[PDB]
């Protein structure tokens, strides 16, 4: 099995088309070499948001392995200078990083990201899946 | 002033042409967005080695900021499934990571890397410098 990071995302103005370029429901597979970027720039970020309130690159997610663990984990790093990044009740400034648990909440601007990791056997590949939440998450 | 990572490298086959692609003595600037990659593949790594005992991508270096401290630090992560990576006295398997102190020793295969962080005040970019050592470092 491939480890998939399910991301349930919400924004108060999500119907405006800020997720116009995001492909939901389906799974997309990445190699373990990849650093997945989120932001406003389509040339830099794999996942783009049609929103001027989001930095050119908002933050990045990359897979890693905890010591003597045979499965993937994910580390996050804030790439935004003006906007902070809330990993539950821990605030991340510019170029701050943190190892994500199995279940955590992401907040930046007025975006809400529910993050749940479902593990697999693989360590050389991971998948992502986006689900748009109709109601707020908090 | 920019934070520079000075890397002193040693390998007994350094005269054979392993380092014919590495520009020594110079400084090279990198944005804080970029993740530095070392390995055998010239299309996947910024700094490449001709040795066939080096994996496609040996390991990665990326900048970040520890909490409170507004100066750049560096995280290393082994990208080699086969060859383990030694940071001072700690072994790193595939996708194992570790944050580097100002001065530490890297070791993979027959390679030896001396890493020293020369702090600058800029957090928007960093620089690298390669120094060759006639004598082994350990």
Residue numbers in the entry:
A (entry chain B), B (entry chain A): 12 to 149
Paper passage:
TIFA has an FHA domain, involved in its binding to phosphothreonine (pThr), and has a consensus TRAF6-binding motif [PXEXX(Ar/Ac); Ar, aromatic; Ac, acidic; X, any] at the C-terminus for interaction with the TRAF-C domain of TRAF6 (TRAF6-C).
Size-exclusion chromatography experiments of T9D/C36S and T9E/C36S showed that the phosphorylation-mimicking at Thr9 is partially involved in the TIFA assembly in solution (discussed later).
